Design a protein around this ligand. Structure first.
Ligand SMILES: C#CCCCC(=O)N[C@H]1[C@@H](OP(=O)(O)OP(=O)(O)OC[C@H]2O[C@@H](n3ccc(=O)[nH]c3=O)[C@H](O)[C@@H]2O)O[C@H](CO)[C@H](O)[C@@H]1O
Ligand SMILES: C#CCCCC(=O)N[C@H]1[C@@H](OP(=O)(O)OP(=O)(O)OC[C@H]2O[C@@H](n3ccc(=O)[nH]c3=O)[C@H](O)[C@@H]2O)O[C@H](CO)[C@H](O)[C@@H]1O
Ligand SMILES: [Mn+2]
Ligand SMILES: [Mn+2]
Lengths: 495, 491
């Protein structure tokens, strides 16, 4: 009902500001004062590669229903999101902007924006949470393509076209922009790396992977090409509406936050679709350290519930490596999964083993016969080879959870092995250094056992325990197996 | 004449037997203590202990070269390649005494079955000495070995089988480790390939995750290595001769392994590590012999001679890493350059892209490259992405989080993220941001003779004063010591 530039920022974000001498980081866990300071149509730097910036972008594309979901968002941030969509998108490609107010304390936060050009507002009468709220918006979407966005984003130049171009060509692609960084303190728009893919460790937390050398090198002469990501971050993405609904939408019994990104990423890949990051599509996002909103069941409890619900449906037996990494999770009940499990069989979906081998080989999987795996931790320090080969001393170095020269397995043969070099007891005398040797299934000197409730690591057939007191003066040793803190070793993944 | 078991170990080792490390830079006492036919553990994979090895293979002339070797070690080598190789596959053992102080060291072994001794009139060095032995070889196939090695069970067959199938293969065993102090025979990793950094010193690369996955099926298969260590290898004799043998004007040590490795690959052959061939070797810390030329100088001479012939333009990245090498003269190379054209031979860019892709290579419009060193510490990203603080962390010389370039666009870049001066006030933290060729805040210059790193259009220099507290800062810029930065490669 109003052209967006004629909308009044100052009247909106007006009372709802930050009174004198209050906490600026109060309601949203980002600096609201700095957010409020900025204009709705603020200038941001074009963070795209030269290759993108300078390409007649296709505009004969199917239009999209943009779904933004929010609970207690900062008016400034919400507005800036909405306007950035309208300002930077070709107008014919925006069918509508659906705002799903997920039970925000003041309905006026969302309601007032309903004045704006193509903005509809849908209020949740109770608290539904991120996933359910997104599904509502998608069901209310008129367009043939869905675009999701977090409520504190800022679309960049020609952001939408490259996303649509992908989905229009192939409906099975679920496509995400590069997530530029909006600083939570100063609110500066910072350009992010285009050399990353999304991923995870066995704890099933999202993390950004560096692109492998083999991959980068294959993309050297096509730097702005699509990136095939094993996981989407989950905040900003575009998906064909019919594909979204056919492929099961979201797990409706997930709550608040967390899990859904994992779940959908697995699902899409496993059931014949693909996931991509598009470097020419840039969308800023306010990344933050704490959650500002309430979690009904406890923060970490609900996260585990959702994560479980995903793992239990899609991961097959490899779900155990998650439970191995996060034993605590086994206690959290996750309810019924029959619908989502049948969905899987209904869709004739591939197994997780497929996903691991073809989509995310990079992810280190322990052998079915391994006893433990990962890093061997002692406080902050972790068991490091220090680049040593055969006949080498082994050491400790601060942990960097990247499994480089700090990755170890504890085998069925009872050996502590890195690659095919295994910890070997050269000399049984107390104080003697241990050496890295080639793995023999029978050497006897490289057989180890975990004792004192998986806290220690004892040399088998002996009274001797691995000991780090000698690191700074030679390397790790065997010493007489007693109550030292230097003899304490815990594996990252325990089976 | 005399069979090896009837040879008198005691009495040979006898006139030799007081610092153990002063003689050979390994524990001579422990070496001397051991039997010539010492027991060593079978360090091969199980999937090799059950292999009917084809034994209708060509024989080899084994070339062992030495200058002041330990008698115990030399003998043990010779006997190991007699005991552990099938007799019909050993045509002869050629011992090239490279002007050793007592000629009796080599001469006395002439008594042993299949052993021939050649004394070098003058000091030649390892490459020239090897060429002599190869020219004196009968046999269709050459095997080279260092004079302090110990062949393992069925070591030779897998090497020959490869060369017999395809004469262009140059094959090396996996090099088990003989302890310099203990003299214990220790089994080595089968998950390594040979390689190098831009300083052109040999190093072992841990073979990639991508590779390790592909070799699940047949784990003891040949390894295509971009470099051979250069000590133990087997090569068809005619192929050795045809492909130019060794760069004859190389001296005592070093270079030859690089030179031949490049040559073989570049001129249409292949280099392999064969995991079921196990040969032990006494690895050492410093060289026990003397260098005519002053050690570091001769290494540089040889290395240059190789680089200047085979590396094309990329020789500069070597000179960037080792600036001192641009002087100390490499002499005439016209023959070896002619050799290259004579063979046709592919360019180094080919080698880098097809044989050793994993080698991190700077863009030729970079200004500096490598890590950014301050003391033991290097410039580390600390896993931080865009909008992150950058820091210092002790240098692990292994890449990744500590890889940096200084571009023609004047920017200090890691991956596609560049160092950014967000705030010009002294003491301000610098943040890592996406690289834009037009942001003046992402621009540096190197000043005060490549020692400092100054933010361009400013009075401000990269500084580690704050590094420990939060992150690295941009600082007031003057006589600090925290502002000192050496890039490993400059150009
Ligand atoms: C570009 C760009 C954006 C990329 C950022 C990104 O991937 N964010 C994901 C990341 O989000 P996050 O920033 O930590 O969480 P955030 O507080 O932004 O919550 C997601 C959105 O849903 C809203 N929300 C949240 C919780 C809730 O109960 N109800 C809501 O309506 C909230 O207002 C916000 O707009 O992980 C989530 C896990 O479920 C989702 O997958 C998010 O999409
Ligand atoms: C199996 C197995 C072991 C393989 C180990 C290996 O590759 N060793 C190499 C490694 O050797 P190193 O142990 O550092 O050197 P080392 O002192 O053993 O010299 C190599 C050989 O040359 C001999 N030599 C040396 C100096 C000399 O003037 N004359 C010689 O004949 C020496 O006695 C020995 O037989 O690098 C060398 C660089 O030129 C060669 O490439 C060696 O072959
Ligand atoms: Mn968010
Ligand atoms: Mn040697």
């Amino acid at each position: 009902k109003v052209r967006w530039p004629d909308f009044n920022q100052e009247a909106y974000v007006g009372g709802t500001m930050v009174r004198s001498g209050q906490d600026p980081y109060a309601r949203n866990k980002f600096n609201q004062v700095e957010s409020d300071k900025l204009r709705m149509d603020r200038a941001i730097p074009d963070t795209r590669h030269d290759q993108c910036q300078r390409k007649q972008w296709r505009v004969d594309l199917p239009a999209t229903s943009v779904v933004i979901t929010f609970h207690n968002e900062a008016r400034s941030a919400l507005l800036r999101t909405v306007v950035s969509v309208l300002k930077k998108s070709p107008p014919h490609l925006i069918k509508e902007i659906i705002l799903v107010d997920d039970y925000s304390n003041d309905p006026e936060d969302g309601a007032l924006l309903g004045k704006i050009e193509k903005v509809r507002v849908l209020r949740n009468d109770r608290r539904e949470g991120l996933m359910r709220s997104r599904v509502r918006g998608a069901d209310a979407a008129q367009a043939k393509v869905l675009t999701f966005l977090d409520s504190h984003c800022e679309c960049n130049e020609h952001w939408l076209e490259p996303l649509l171009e992908r989905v229009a060509e192939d409906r099975t692609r679920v496509v995400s922009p590069i997530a530029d960084v909006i600083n939570m303190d100063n609110f500066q728009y910072v350009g992010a790396s285009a050399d990353l893919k999304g991923g995870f460790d066995w704890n099933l937390v999202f993390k950004w992977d560096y692109m492998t050398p083999e991959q980068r090198r294959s993309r050297q002469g096509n730097p702005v090409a699509p990136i095939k990501t094993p996981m989407i971050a989950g905040g900003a993405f575009v998906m064909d509406k019919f594909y979204f609904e056919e492929l099961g939408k979201y797990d409706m019994m997930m709550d608040v936050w967390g899990g859904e990104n994992l779940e959908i990423s697995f699902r899409v890949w496993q059931c014949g679709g693909s996931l991509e990051i598009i470097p020419c599509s840039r969308v800023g996002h306010v990344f933050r350290k704490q959650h500002p909103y309430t979690f009904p069941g406890g923060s970490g409890t609900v996260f585990a519930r959702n994560t479980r619900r995903a793992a239990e449906v899609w991961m097959d037996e490899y779900k155990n490596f998650y439970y191995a990494a996060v034993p605590s999770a086994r206690n959290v009940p996750y309810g019924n999964i029959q619908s989502r499990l049948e969905l899987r069989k209904k869709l004739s979906c591939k197994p997780f083993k497929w996903y691991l081998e073809n989509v995310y080989p990079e992810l280190r999987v322990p052998d079915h016969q391994d006893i433990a795996f990962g890093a061997l931790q002692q406080g902050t320090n972790c068991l490091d080879t220090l680049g040593h080969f055969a006949d080498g001393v082994v050491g400790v170095y601060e942990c960097h959870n990247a499994g480089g020269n700090q990755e170890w397995a504890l085998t069925k043969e009872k050996s502590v092995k890195h690659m095919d070099l295994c910890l070997t007891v050269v000399d049984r005398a107390p104080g003697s250094l241990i050496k890295l040797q080639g793995c023999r299934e029978n050497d006897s000197r490289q057989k180890w056992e975990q004792i004192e409730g998986n806290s220690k690591l004892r040399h088998v057939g002996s009274n001797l325990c691995l000991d780090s007191r000698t690191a700074k003066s030679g390397g790790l040793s065997v010493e007489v197996c007693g109550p030292a803190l230097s003899q304490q070793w815990k594996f990252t993944l325990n089976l």
